[PDB]
Design an enzyme around this catalytic site. Sequence first.
Site, mmCIF file in Angstrom:
data_model
loop_
_atom_site.group_PDB
_atom_site.id
_atom_site.type_symbol
_atom_site.label_atom_id
_atom_site.label_comp_id
_atom_site.label_asym_id
_atom_site.label_seq_id
_atom_site.Cartn_x
_atom_site.Cartn_y
_atom_site.Cartn_z
ATOM 1 N N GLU B 20 70.915 2.025 61.729
ATOM 2 C CA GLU B 20 70.701 2.356 60.715
ATOM 3 C C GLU B 20 71.281 3.880 60.502
ATOM 4 O O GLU B 20 70.645 4.622 61.262
ATOM 5 C CB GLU B 20 69.375 2.313 60.251
ATOM 6 C CG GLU B 20 68.664 0.939 59.924
ATOM 7 C CD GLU B 20 67.308 0.504 59.809
ATOM 8 O OE1 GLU B 20 66.631 1.667 59.727
ATOM 9 O OE2 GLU B 20 66.733 -0.558 59.769
ATOM 10 N N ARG B 164 56.124 6.122 63.195
ATOM 11 C CA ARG B 164 55.775 7.482 62.522
ATOM 12 C C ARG B 164 54.477 7.484 62.665
ATOM 13 O O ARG B 164 53.572 8.430 62.362
ATOM 14 C CB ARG B 164 56.214 7.419 61.155
ATOM 15 C CG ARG B 164 55.796 6.288 60.459
ATOM 16 C CD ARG B 164 56.325 6.359 58.760
ATOM 17 N NE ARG B 164 55.804 5.354 58.086
ATOM 18 C CZ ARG B 164 56.089 4.125 58.038
ATOM 19 N NH1 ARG B 164 57.158 3.537 58.854
ATOM 20 N NH2 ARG B 164 55.373 3.048 57.269
ATOM 21 N N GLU B 174 63.503 6.366 53.205
ATOM 22 C CA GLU B 174 64.234 4.983 53.564
ATOM 23 C C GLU B 174 65.214 5.180 52.243
ATOM 24 O O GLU B 174 64.932 5.467 51.002
ATOM 25 C CB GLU B 174 63.058 3.881 53.333
ATOM 26 C CG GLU B 174 63.830 2.545 52.802
ATOM 27 C CD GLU B 174 64.554 1.919 53.951
ATOM 28 O OE1 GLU B 174 63.533 1.427 54.707
ATOM 29 O OE2 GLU B 174 65.661 2.178 54.249
ATOM 30 N N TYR B 284 65.153 -8.438 57.662
ATOM 31 C CA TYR B 284 63.931 -9.212 57.275
ATOM 32 C C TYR B 284 64.114 -10.881 57.343
ATOM 33 O O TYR B 284 62.916 -11.548 57.072
ATOM 34 C CB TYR B 284 63.389 -8.720 55.779
ATOM 35 C CG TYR B 284 62.959 -7.437 56.081
ATOM 36 C CD1 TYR B 284 62.840 -6.751 57.446
ATOM 37 C CD2 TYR B 284 62.285 -6.802 54.941
ATOM 38 C CE1 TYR B 284 62.400 -5.282 57.426
ATOM 39 C CE2 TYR B 284 61.826 -5.270 55.038
ATOM 40 C CZ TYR B 284 61.709 -4.711 56.342
ATOM 41 O OH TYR B 284 61.143 -3.478 56.298
HETATM 42 ZN ZN LIG Z 1 64.758 0.580 60.108
#
Ligand SMILES: [Zn+2]
Lengths: 307, 307
Positions: B20, B164, B174, B284
């Site tokens: 990411e 977190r 996000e 996912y």
């Molecule tokens: Zn992520």
Amino acid sequence: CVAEEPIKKIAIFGGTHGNELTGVFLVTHWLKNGAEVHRAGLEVKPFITNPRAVEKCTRYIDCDLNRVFDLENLSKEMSEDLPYEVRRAQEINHLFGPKNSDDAYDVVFDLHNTTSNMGCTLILGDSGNDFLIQMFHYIKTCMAPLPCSVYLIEHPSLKYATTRSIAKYPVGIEVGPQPHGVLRADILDQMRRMLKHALDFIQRFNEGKEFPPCAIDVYKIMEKVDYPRNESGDVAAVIHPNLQDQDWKPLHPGDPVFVSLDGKVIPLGGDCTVYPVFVNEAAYYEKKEAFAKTTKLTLNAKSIRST
Amino acid sequence: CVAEEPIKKIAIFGGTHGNELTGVFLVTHWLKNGAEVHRAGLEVKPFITNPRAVEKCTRYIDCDLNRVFDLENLSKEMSEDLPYEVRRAQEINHLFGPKNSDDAYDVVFDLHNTTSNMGCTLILGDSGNDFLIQMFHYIKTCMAPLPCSVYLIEHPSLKYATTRSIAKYPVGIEVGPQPHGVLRADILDQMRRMLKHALDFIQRFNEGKEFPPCAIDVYKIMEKVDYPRNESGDVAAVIHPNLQDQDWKPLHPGDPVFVSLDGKVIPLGGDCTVYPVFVNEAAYYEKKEAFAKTTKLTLNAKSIRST
Ligand SMILES: [Zn+2]
Ligand SMILES: [Zn+2]
């Protein structure tokens, strides 16, 4: 008029890269249910080329399967440290080749996705091949008004080692934009329509349809452009938002190509208009390719007919 | 009015998932060039949480780093069997926690990207947290009329093991859609803007700005919805093109949700309108989540100020 032999053996390859899901999903479906890819008089064989990478949802295990079908690799003896994909390439060559033999499959469609906004893309390896130019003209006519763009590779290095290169008539089918590891319904529909028309073309050809002369525009790769890099070799600037998603659209020397975090713009440079392809493809960061520059040209095909 | 102590210790985590790239690129930059995240009176520490996954550009090495911050894992004895991400979570907990101590960092911003069309998204873990509701209201207000949506993920089974969760005030940031392994300039500018306002909020709060009562809309998770699957466990249908990219928009019982290759459409079902989030996120598929159904609700926050 180019007189030509009928096509008998066709393969449809999916999962050459294991995280490019559209070809995986379609080939997996057609293995179960082949009616969609049946054509009278044709032997059509769907096949998953890198099932080990597909099971891991990864591009490759040891090295890119799409770079190891050159003669040296196909003839290499096994050794302990040899990449898995070299052994897999030989296994595929044993089934669908041997490459360069009269027994090789006539047509191989190798199915790929890209994270770049390239839309429906056909990859052509031989600018003199009337049969393929005709096939591509047919597919484009059938897909219209969806653009269906043709990428031409002349350089031997970027084609001779590809998975599709085992066929007498190699055909790359490339559809994006799609993130790797994702299946989008729209992209699936586009790829299945491209195949439907390609197979229809082959059956018509076999049945003796004479195709008149035609011409297509194609984009011939000139050179890769890497990202600007810091001393340490990490990316120093990213694709400019004006270039992002604008694959195929003409780019002029002053047009912006990269942008840094501070907002510095880096323009194309050089002295000519180019047509960028594979703009911001995820698999290409490590291949040192932010995008490839292409030039546009017209190819003509003579009429063709089966013998 | 809720009075709270000044915020002192802030961390900005990038690369919790190594593919990411927005948080990796920003954090990497700020480690060398910190001026953008400098605020008067604040100690701001950028940190790359999964350097091994970052170097391989993969989500994780052994297991998901965002799933191993539960006390069982964090209190696990050092051995040779230990998953890399377990050993790393314990290092992070030592540096930025320990989780549940008064010595833990005050705020941790954990930076994520998604392939889903979600736009700028703030993740809230506690619907009673006046300070976080006020921060999120501030960020939304400052970005208006640009989309800035809040996803409320509250149950302990969902919140307890995240990277977190070490902080007193965990914040998830996000932004999508972005293919993993790709850096888009637009996504980078969106995440930088969210962070700019978040840090501006903290400074103003510390400086004695008194915030009156506010309210925000949030989408609270109801339940994950998996893809329809074949006996084998492979996906039997994909996200319907009418749902694809339509994150946050109301979805009713008879609206189409999946489509098979054979063309069967599968509707939402059930008896209520829901708001889908994380529609078609690549990571996912293996978590059995084609999308999450959410319900929309308004949260109020008391006036807050610093002591
Ligand atoms: Zn992520
Ligand atoms: Zn590919």
